[PDB]
Amino acid sequence: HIKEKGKPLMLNPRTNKGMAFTLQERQMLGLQGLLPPKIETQDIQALRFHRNLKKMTSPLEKYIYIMGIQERNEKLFYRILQDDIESLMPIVYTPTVGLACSQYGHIFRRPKGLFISISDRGHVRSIVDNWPENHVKAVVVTDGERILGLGDLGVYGMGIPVGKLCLYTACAGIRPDQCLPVCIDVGTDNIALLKDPFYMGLYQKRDRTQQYDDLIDEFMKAITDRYGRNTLIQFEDFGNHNAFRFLRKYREKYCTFNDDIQGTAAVALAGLLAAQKVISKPISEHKILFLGAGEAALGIANLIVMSMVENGLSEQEAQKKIWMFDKYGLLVKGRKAKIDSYQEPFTHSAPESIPDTFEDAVNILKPSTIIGVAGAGRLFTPDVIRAMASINERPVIFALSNPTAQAECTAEEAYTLTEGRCLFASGSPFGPVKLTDGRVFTPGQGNNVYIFPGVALAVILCNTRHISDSVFLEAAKALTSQLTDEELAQGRLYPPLANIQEVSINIAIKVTEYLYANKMAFVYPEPEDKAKYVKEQTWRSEYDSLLPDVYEWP
Amino acid sequence: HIKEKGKPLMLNPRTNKGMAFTLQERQMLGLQGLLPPKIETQDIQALRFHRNLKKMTSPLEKYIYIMGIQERNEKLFYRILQDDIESLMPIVYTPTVGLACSQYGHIFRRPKGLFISISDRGHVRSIVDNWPENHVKAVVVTDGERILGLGDLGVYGMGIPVGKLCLYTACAGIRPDQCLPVCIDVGTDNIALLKDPFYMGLYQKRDRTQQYDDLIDEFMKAITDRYGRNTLIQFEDFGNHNAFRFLRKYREKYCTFNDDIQGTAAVALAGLLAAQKVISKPISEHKILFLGAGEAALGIANLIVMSMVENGLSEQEAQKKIWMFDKYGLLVKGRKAKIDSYQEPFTHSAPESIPDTFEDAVNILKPSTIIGVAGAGRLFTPDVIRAMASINERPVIFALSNPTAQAECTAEEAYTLTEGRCLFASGSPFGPVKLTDGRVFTPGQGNNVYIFPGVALAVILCNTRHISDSVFLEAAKALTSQLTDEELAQGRLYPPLANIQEVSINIAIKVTEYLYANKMAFVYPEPEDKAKYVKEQTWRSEYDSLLPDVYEWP
Amino acid sequence: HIKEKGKPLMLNPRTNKGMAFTLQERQMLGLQGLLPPKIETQDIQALRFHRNLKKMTSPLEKYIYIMGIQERNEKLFYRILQDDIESLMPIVYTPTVGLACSQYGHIFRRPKGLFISISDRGHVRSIVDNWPENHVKAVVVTDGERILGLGDLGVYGMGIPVGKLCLYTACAGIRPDQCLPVCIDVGTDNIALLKDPFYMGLYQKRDRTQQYDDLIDEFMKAITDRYGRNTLIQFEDFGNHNAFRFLRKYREKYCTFNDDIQGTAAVALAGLLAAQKVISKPISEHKILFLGAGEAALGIANLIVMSMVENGLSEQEAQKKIWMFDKYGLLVKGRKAKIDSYQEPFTHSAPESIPDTFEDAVNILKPSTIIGVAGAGRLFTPDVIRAMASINERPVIFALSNPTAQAECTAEEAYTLTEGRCLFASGSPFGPVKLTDGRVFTPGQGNNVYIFPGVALAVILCNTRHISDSVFLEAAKALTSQLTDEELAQGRLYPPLANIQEVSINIAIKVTEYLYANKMAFVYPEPEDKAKYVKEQTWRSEYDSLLPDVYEWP
Numbered sequence A, B, C: 001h002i003k004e005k006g007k008p009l010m011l012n013p014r015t016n017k018g019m020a021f022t023l024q025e026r027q028m029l030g031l032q033g034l035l036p037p038k039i040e041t042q043d044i045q046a047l048r049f050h051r052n053l054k055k056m057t058s059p060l061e062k063y064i065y066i067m068g069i070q071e072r073n074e075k076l077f078y079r080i081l082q083d084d085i086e087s088l089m090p091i092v093y094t095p096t097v098g099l100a101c102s103q104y105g106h107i108f109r110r111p112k113g114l115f116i117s118i119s120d121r122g123h124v125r126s127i128v129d130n131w132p133e134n135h136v137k138a139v140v141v142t143d144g145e146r147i148l149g150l151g152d153l154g155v156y157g158m159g160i161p162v163g164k165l166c167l168y169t170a171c172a173g174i175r176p177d178q179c180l181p182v183c184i185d186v187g188t189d190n191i192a193l194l195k196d197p198f199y200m201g202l203y204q205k206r207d208r209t210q211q212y213d214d215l216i217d218e219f220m221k222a223i224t225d226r227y228g229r230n231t232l233i234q235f236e237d238f239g240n241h242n243a244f245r246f247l248r249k250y251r252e253k254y255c256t257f258n259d260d261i262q263g264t265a266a267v268a269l270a271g272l273l274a275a276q277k278v279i280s281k282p283i284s285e286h287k288i289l290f291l292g293a294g295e296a297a298l299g300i301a302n303l304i305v306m307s308m309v310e311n312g313l314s315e316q317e318a319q320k321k322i323w324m325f326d327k328y329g330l331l332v333k334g335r336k337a338k339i340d341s342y343q344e345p346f347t348h349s350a351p352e353s354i355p356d357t358f359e360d361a362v363n364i365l366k367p368s369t370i371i372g373v374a375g376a377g378r379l380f381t382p383d384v385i386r387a388m389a390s391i392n393e394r395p396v397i398f399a400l401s402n403p404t405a406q407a408e409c410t411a412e413e414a415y416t417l418t419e420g421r422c423l424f425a426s427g428s429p430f431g432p433v434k435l436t437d438g439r440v441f442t443p444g445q446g447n448n449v450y451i452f453p454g455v456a457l458a459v460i461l462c463n464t465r466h467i468s469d470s471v472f473l474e475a476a477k478a479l480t481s482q483l484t485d486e487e488l489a490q491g492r493l494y495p496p497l498a499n500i501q502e503v504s505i506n507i508a509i510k511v512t513e514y515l516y517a518n519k520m521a522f523v524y525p526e527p528e529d530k531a532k533y534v535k536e537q538t539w540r541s542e543y544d545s546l547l548p549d550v551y552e553w554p
């Protein structure tokens, strides 16, 4: 059932079916003549798309084309994504989405999402009231300060929330109409954008006064006021300072989490857990060195500690196995560079000698695992990689910074320089690597896309009010538990991306069972079969009938 | 004043302004938050477009991009076309529009126009009633049987009426909302399309029974019943047989004309009229030979006769100067191949010897003017062109068949082979030609786009009921009268394409003055200054204010 | 926010303000010119209404006029009701609503509510999907078999759910857009209606097959499927058999109650609880005799027992003090007339002699309290009343059957025949009575209107899932606790009807606090101050601004 008929049905991508509108639907809904005589199936439409995509050359050109369908025919858009999520992920998500954002103003055609600028302070609710959908259940918001490892892109960062939410639906079957991408515009410090005639935001530097916090507050209140107190709000790509303080400030008041801190933490742990299964290495022999000490590093470290603790280690001893090296060097007690409360637990007494470079840090500390999360480029140099391979029989190397150009190192560099002995994972995709001896290694992608879709679905379906760290610990376990022995032997630390749909649903199932078992679910009545309940609630890309109910009376 | 507010204003390309909506319009119309904070000018938007277009490679890719804008922001679409009509004409019109039609079903995104199929017989009115616009003033309809010189493309032919109408607006300032592209689908004989899974029409051979004629009758009736008996109906790309009979059948009952017979007839004459001024040749000495004897040849021949008649020659004398050579050879009394009543006046007693090829026809008849209108490819061979150059000092050579691949010959071939002595014109665009002696020749485009926009505007504004042949004779004179002596010397047989807007308006002005003088206009009150009236009535691509009228009460 | 503009805002009674639309709203929303130049306040509008009402003569005429305003200007409709609820209650509610119902098909103008017929079996969800409001929270449904004490009125009974819901808003401030009146039409056994050409329902006798139960099931499921499992569903005026059956069947599965069994039970108990205070009578000396043994009698008796039990008596002891006399006579063990499980607890060993009439029952049993609830007219004859006055110093006499003509006796009869010693209450309104000694007695109205509004508000605000009997016991205490000692001496057994609004809110507050204290509330976060929370959530009749948020950017 839909209230609009005629042309409006075609102009609205949510309802538009193109030539898939049946003859009966066309005649009854006033579309006869507005569409070519041909009646098509979604299959034919999907074929038309794949035929055209194949003739395209640049990833960006493909991004514009596919994302364009989200604004023409929503059902078809998700069908297309669903046909081959693995081959399209690189286009609609990292790394291409990063390219899209850097040139967002140049490729603009139609707006996507909700825009709230600091100039709208005191009027946010009226803006939230302008969103057409009334049953929003999930929001992904960014202020564009830390877009991937690209930095401050301001309003051009909107491409991120839009991308994340496309994955909510494509990966976890979350209803598109229940999702709302939001961009908070308080200005940008990117000088180049301030001089770009195509910039889509306020031409001012970022407002870092109390007005900033107040706007975010008005945003949180406005969203929940209209849609409900348990509306899921996923903070995405906020700067380091703001990311933590907002998480700390709102996690016990609203249903919210930060993808970059918590989502990335879960996927990383999941990979480390998979690696532990292939190496069967002693938790006591684990020495983890982080390249970076921000949102991801701190998030990951904290989840790692929670894991070691549940495994018979004290919080203190677990923390001692973790070191961090930020842009100023190793986090050691008494260093010149600042150390906040979050970093304190991982800041140890300075070792014998103090390293100047990350390479020095690797040789002095002799870590068994190295995790790259500095979003600053190829910091895992060939020498850093060799060091890890000479020190460890099976070194674990994670280059998680996105997009591809910001990655610490490539899959080819890792596998070749370690003679195929490393266990590698990255945030951005790399194809398989073949060494001179003929062995082929398939790098897994430690990207939060394996986590937020499933966690979002569970939280939404259970009407969860708040998200604890343990929820992400569980998602991590749920992710790695899906790896098959065969896949582990392949060098895979994560289930194949081609199966991300089924993987996300299983995660959702495992997390909802966890929520119920820990009194964090508030749905009634409580379904008896959680798995069956989640699977039944998923949105489908198949067209629905728009025919009015017609029948004879006795 | 608009009756819609909110998202719908953005979903409707007619009203959507993208980031050009002012802050007040957004706040008052409920769009705040739905658009990026940025407020843009149409100039910036036009800049964004040209920036992107410049990076594209194939003409079809550009066609898809520009025509896509027509479905997103109509004002911008026409602003873009008006910015540089000359460089985009080859993309939205011939030859690219022919390529677009050939694969219309493959590049399909959104439907454009009204589709009426034979399966809708008896229900055409309900289809016409589904069109959202209430004030249609002009219709361009095709059945796709004779799409340019490409043949039967069926429903894929819809691309033609759409393009013609874009030009109604772009060239003559006719309101887009008053235009209606129509495709009559009675099936198609194109075997390739019948086996094409992306075909957009009925999968059946063309219905050539009484049902066909009845459907066309129902169409005419339905359009005029809803929009008025004086609604302009421009038949476009119909097959030979049908084209003439429908013109004869409806020209005195409805406000209708056939672009291929009459429009093309006027452009051709216009070029011949221009040529006569550059070489000052007495038409008693003009011997014209047509390659083809169909819609265009007969249309052109009839207008030529009318021109010679008003210039002191008897109809008989004028017709004797015209010869035609179709796919069976020279039209001569007593030939085996059929000769209908339209061709009879130009079928003369066989010459001394009967020609086998067009080349033979040229050498035996020794024409001074050769007009290619067979839509069959390069029939004006190098030898044909050489023959015209040896027989005449300044041969007139017209290769009017579209698209480019169907043209009788290129500008390069004509100018070079005649050593720059020919007066050449083509239906499809060719770049300037530079001969070994340094002389540069700029070929004119004798395409009906120089005629239908101006004639359509005059007929619409004058509420004309029927269109006589004389109207096209006048349009032809109006076109050529705009050539300046300096342009004649350039080898220009038509005003520069870059000036098609003002050229179309001036033609419209001359035609309306002609309509009033001949009691064919029915407008009340009758404007005293026709020129001023026409120019004031033209639709503009500048954005209109959508703000409600707000003011204070005393 | 408002998604509509122009004429539609005036055609929708929910938004229409008449001349109360401000100049700014008219100009910005496109209403300028569609309304007289005059700008009016709701005060002036209310005056216009009262001015006209005062000139009317019949109650039904007034009913048609006021109810018509609900379909023209909803805000004004409730403002009017709020101005003088006490004087209008008899018009919009009992007894006039009874008359309206009997002639519903004759006074019909616009339909109100949702209609679901047996002929729609299997298609109920599509009917529910047609209701315009998306946030329904409460439903009052009837099948019209037992409308007041009038019997089977079929679809004409829709007047009841409509009236009841008008009171949800007028008395408890429940949002009108969140209320849905429903009439289930499975036919009617009322012969007169089946021959009435203005009848509004199916022309068939009641379907009492399995199809009936199935339809009600489909109804419950469809309502909750669209609006939520906790949607409040108030059954109203269903026949005896079905009333209990559906209450027992759905009370633990849905959020539902039967107004006639539970609502009436609470208001009656409240009256008795008030009488308790005016005469300080020992519960052991309480001898109660019901005239009737159906929906109301059983409901009231059960609640009375719960009250005595909570006060130191065993269930058995309490039930022993209650006797019932239905149409076949006194409910005694072994009588010929049927006795079901609900009546068994009040069916005692036959007394010395078996009474023929209710009068005999009074003389043989010598009850101290008499409760009339047989919906059969003046069964409390002058002799019955005298018997109660001769047997008791201060007899308690309740004539609860509606409408007025169906009441067991009038207030005049009660007070005069008992010489002002009786404590009287009725379902339908009676004016004050003055005896010959000059004493004035003000009869209270023991009608469930004092209960369902407050209970509905509490259940809705607390998102309560199911309603226990104890909730009605609490509502009863909440109602009576509102009486001041001053009022008790005035013969008051209920707070003044003129204060019904504050009385309902207070009942709503007490019930919500009861729900929270007994883990039956599921709202979060839980408000600290329940009274403040409830009062802040109430819908107000004051016009709201419809102006779009316009403001300057810095």
Ligand SMILES: Nc1ncnc2c1ncn2[C@@H]1O[C@H](COP(=O)(O)OP(=O)(O)OP(=O)(O)O)[C@@H](O)[C@H]1O
Pocket (backbone or CB within 6 Å): A146, A148, A149, A239, A240, A260, A264, A291, A292, A293, A294, A295, A296, A297, A325, A326, A327, A328, A373, A374, A375, A376, A379, A400, A401, A402
């Ligand atoms: N050149 C560098 N060498 C080592 N560490 C660096 C270097 N450059 C930046 N870093 C560190 O990387 C961390 C970035 O933290 P931030 O919170 O900004 O992002 P993040 O969440 O780690 O980002 P990502 O999304 O890339 O994982 C900081 O601790 C910073 O000191």
Ligand SMILES: Nc1ncnc2c1ncn2[C@@H]1O[C@H](COP(=O)(O)OP(=O)(O)OP(=O)(O)O)[C@@H](O)[C@H]1O
Pocket (backbone or CB within 6 Å): B146, B148, B149, B239, B240, B260, B291, B292, B293, B294, B295, B296, B297, B325, B326, B327, B328, B373, B374, B375, B376, B379, B400, B401, B402
């Ligand atoms: N190979 C050929 N050589 C000479 N004449 C040809 C040849 N092929 C086709 N013709 C002629 O060209 C004419 C085409 O007439 P038709 O009515 O189909 O289209 P048209 O409008 O005249 O041409 P165009 O499509 O170029 O505008 C016919 O008279 C046909 O006999």
Ligand SMILES: Nc1ncnc2c1ncn2[C@@H]1O[C@H](COP(=O)(O)OP(=O)(O)OP(=O)(O)O)[C@@H](O)[C@H]1O
Pocket (backbone or CB within 6 Å): C146, C148, C149, C239, C240, C260, C291, C292, C293, C294, C295, C296, C297, C325, C326, C327, C328, C372, C373, C374, C375, C376, C379, C400, C401, C402
């Ligand atoms: N004439 C009568 N004398 C005594 N009892 C009667 C008489 N007529 C009907 N009754 C009884 O009144 C009761 C009516 O029960 P029912 O469930 O139909 O409605 P109710 O909700 O109790 O009545 P109301 O809503 O009018 O107060 C029955 O037990 C019936 O036997």
Ligand SMILES: O=C(O)/C=C/C(=O)O
Pocket (backbone or CB within 6 Å): A017, A018, A019, A020, A044, A045, A046, A048, A049, A069, A072, A073, A076, B108, B109, B110
């Ligand atoms: O295949 C279709 O009908 C739609 C294609 C698109 O919107 O690109």
Ligand SMILES: O=C(O)/C=C/C(=O)O
Pocket (backbone or CB within 6 Å): A108, A109, A110, B017, B018, B019, B045, B046, B048, B049, B069, B072, B073, B076
């Ligand atoms: O420049 C714009 O705002 C619109 C571009 C488009 O529709 O392609």
Ligand SMILES: O=C([O-])C(=O)[O-]
Pocket (backbone or CB within 6 Å): A147, A148, A149, A237, A259, A260, A401, A402, A427, A447, A448, A449
């Ligand atoms: O910011 C990132 O790199 C991400 O979310 O994957």
Ligand SMILES: O=C([O-])C(=O)[O-]
Pocket (backbone or CB within 6 Å): B147, B148, B149, B237, B259, B260, B401, B402, B403, B427, B447, B448
């Ligand atoms: O048909 C054609 O070639 C035209 O209209 O230009």
Ligand SMILES: O=C([O-])C(=O)[O-]
Pocket (backbone or CB within 6 Å): C147, C148, C149, C237, C259, C260, C401, C402, C403, C427, C447, C448
């Ligand atoms: O049925 C009744 O009389 C009532 O509900 O008031």
Ligand SMILES: [Mn+2]
Pocket (backbone or CB within 6 Å): A148, A236, A237, A259, A260
């Ligand atoms: Mn991120």
Ligand SMILES: [Mn+2]
Pocket (backbone or CB within 6 Å): B148, B236, B237, B259, B260
């Ligand atoms: Mn044509």
Ligand SMILES: [Mn+2]
Pocket (backbone or CB within 6 Å): C148, C236, C237, C259, C260
């Ligand atoms: Mn009732």
